[PDB]
Amino acid sequence: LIETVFVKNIRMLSFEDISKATHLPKDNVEHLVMRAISLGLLKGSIDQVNELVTISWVQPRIISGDQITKMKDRLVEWNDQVEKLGKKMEARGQSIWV
Amino acid sequence: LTKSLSIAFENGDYAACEKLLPPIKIELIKNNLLIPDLSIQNDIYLNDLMITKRILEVGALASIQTFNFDSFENYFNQLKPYYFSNNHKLSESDKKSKLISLYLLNLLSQNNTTKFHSELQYLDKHIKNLEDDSLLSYPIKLDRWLMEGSYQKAWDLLQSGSQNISEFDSFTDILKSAIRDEIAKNTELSYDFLPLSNIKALLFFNNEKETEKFALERNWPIVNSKVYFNNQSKEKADYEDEMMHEEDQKTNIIEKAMDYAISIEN
């Protein structure tokens, strides 16, 4: 369960994903979802009406090499945002900056 | 020679009218010089001016039937100040009413209502009142029903045009194609999916095949003989929205704040 959850970083998973991976009946599925939550391994809430688990928190694990690069790619993008935004806004209402 | 042209119309060759016109255009300098160009009007000059108008006039009618717009319009430019002169010279004619009618239909076919109404405002005094509406009723009413929203009425005028064609069909064709487009656009937002029978009936097509021709040109999927308007039109709209014009007219929420603050502090 921890393996399936970590790879799909999207914020929602149907019960059907869990059923197939662990090969269990659906009765047992929602209990297994209660256990993870009790461990604190995972945090989130359970929708029984739509049969969803909304995962809202993942617990950090061993950061592999591939992931070092992934982090870096996003940080450049977010460098640029700060950079673009400060430069234009200095120019706007340049006259007053006492 | 002014009678060489004259007879060229009665003969009924408007291709003959066309090939003869360019030698006369040098001659039409000479006609201009005969009149002192309205510095003083006398009855000798009333006669001289009658010939000039007649020449320009037979040339104008020719261009509409040979479908050459450019020449028609130019002549028309001249023709107006020629007709408007003083209070009444010998401007009043059967052709006067007829020529106005055509001009207005043209302006509607260009899908330029701006100028249509402008031209209408010019007419709306003396001339429209004295001649009543009897050939004018054809463009006034056409333009009027398209504004009103009653398309059925706007269509029937186009169809009944048949008893009067002599040069009017050259506009009738252009105007129709634009009317079906108009209908299609209103009905885009109204409803996404229409039965096959209703798409045809609305647009007043004679045939189903013509309907599917207009879909393909319009970039709309036909799926189970039902048109779908929603997809492409929305995408296109999105793409159109992004240009180097509408970027300074958006106004960013952060930008609004700056401007409010600094105006106090100036």
Swiss-Prot record, chain A:
Protein name (record): 26S proteasome regulatory subunit RPN9
Family of this protein: Belongs to the proteasome subunit S11 family.
Function: Acts as a regulatory subunit of the 26S proteasome which is involved in the ATP-dependent degradation of ubiquitinated proteins.
Misc. remarks from the entry: Present with 12400 molecules/cell in log phase SD medium.
The species this protein was found in: Saccharomyces cerevisiae (strain ATCC 204508 / S288c)
Curated annotation (Swiss-Prot), chain B:
Keywords of the record: Proteasome
InterPro entries named among the record's database cross-references: 26S_Psome_Rpn12, CSN8_PSD8_EIF3K, PCI_dom
Record flagged with keyword Cytoplasm: no
Stretch forming the signal peptide: none
Domain PCI: residue ranges: 70-245
CC per GO annotation: nucleus; proteasome complex; proteasome regulatory particle, lid subcomplex; proteasome storage granule
Gene Ontology BP term (one): proteasome-mediated ubiquitin-dependent protein catabolic process
Domain of life of the source: Eukaryota
Pfam assignment, any one: CSN8_PSD8_EIF3K
Miscellaneous: Present with 9890 molecules/cell in log phase SD medium.
Family: Belongs to the proteasome subunit S14 family.
Known function: Acts as a regulatory subunit of the 26S proteasome which is involved in the ATP-dependent degradation of ubiquitinated proteins. Necessary for activation of the CDC28 kinase.
Name of this protein: 26S proteasome regulatory subunit RPN12
Species this protein is from: Saccharomyces cerevisiae (strain ATCC 204508 / S288c)
Taxon lineage: Eukaryota, Fungi, Dikarya, Ascomycota, Saccharomycotina
Gene expressing this chain: RPN12
